[PDB]
Amino acid sequence: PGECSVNVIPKKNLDKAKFFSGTWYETHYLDMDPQATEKFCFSFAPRESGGTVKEALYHFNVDSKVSFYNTGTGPLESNGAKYTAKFNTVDKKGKEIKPADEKYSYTVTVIEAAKQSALIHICLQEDGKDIGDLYSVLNRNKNALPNKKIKKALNKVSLVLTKFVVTKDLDCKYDDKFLSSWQK
Numbered sequence: 001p002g003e004c005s006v007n008v009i010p011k012k013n014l015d016k017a018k019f020f021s022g023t024w025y026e027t028h029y030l031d032m033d034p035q036a037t038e039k040f041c042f043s044f045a046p047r048e049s050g051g052t053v054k055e056a057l058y059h060f061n062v063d064s065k066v067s068f069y070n071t072g073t074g075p076l077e078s079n080g081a082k083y084t085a086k087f088n089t090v091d092k093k094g095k096e097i098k099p100a101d102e103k104y105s106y107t108v109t110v111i112e113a114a115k116q117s118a119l120i121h122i123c124l125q126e127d128g129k130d131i132g133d134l135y136s137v138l139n140r141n142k143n144a145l146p147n148k149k150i151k152k153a154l155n156k157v158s159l160v161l162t163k164f165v166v167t168k169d170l171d172c173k174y175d176d177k178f179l180s181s182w183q184k
């Protein structure tokens with residue numbers, strides 16, 4: 001049903017200080033549920049310290065024109081490129097408007113990172129069981145195409161980039177200040 005993908009391999013020796021800094025924009029995404037067809041834009045600001053990831057998340061539903069903000073927190077695995085987070089809901093000012101529900105979590109794997117590009121996978125869970133997953137190509141620049149190493153990573157697991165939704169064509173609205181001000 002909502003079974004998460006196998007063969008999701010964390011990058012060996014990810015540079016933590018570089019990846020867990022600044023703002024990342026999703027440029028392409030592939031939701032593994034073919035009926036998940038509402039268009040979205042996504043950006044986030046992940047940070048790490050002492051083996052714990054603390055990240056600010058921004059989603060924008062293009063269909064409904066509604067944005068939502070979250071923060072996620074959880075332990076980084078010993079491989080340094082995978083983490084499982086609990087999350088709450090905040091407003092644009094960072095104030096909590098809905099508390100975390102302990103039964104929900106997500107697991108992010110950083111599959112590849114090169115230059116100003118990255119490829120991540122996220123598995124959403126409820127009570128530790130898979131409910132859905134998605135792959136996303138990230139870039140420091142909203143309108144940029146991915147480094148070839150990201151396509152190589154996709155091809156290693158029989159995915160091709162043309163199958164992904166491209167958001168540069170979408171009418172995205174971003175809250176960049178929410179992310180730039182994260183932990184300031």
Ligand code: HEM
Nearest residue numbers: 026029040041042057059068070087089106108122134136
């Ligand atoms: C990159 C492309 C992404 C897309 C297109 C996307 C899309 C979505 C969609 C459709 C939902 C459900 C919204 C709803 O129920 O109305 C959602 C929820 C959520 N996503 Fe994503 N997502 C992306 C990336 C991520 C990433 C990378 C993370 C974590 C690092 C993440 C964390 C979450 C969380 C925590 C929720 C639940 C929010 C809540 O219940 O308040 N998403 N996303």
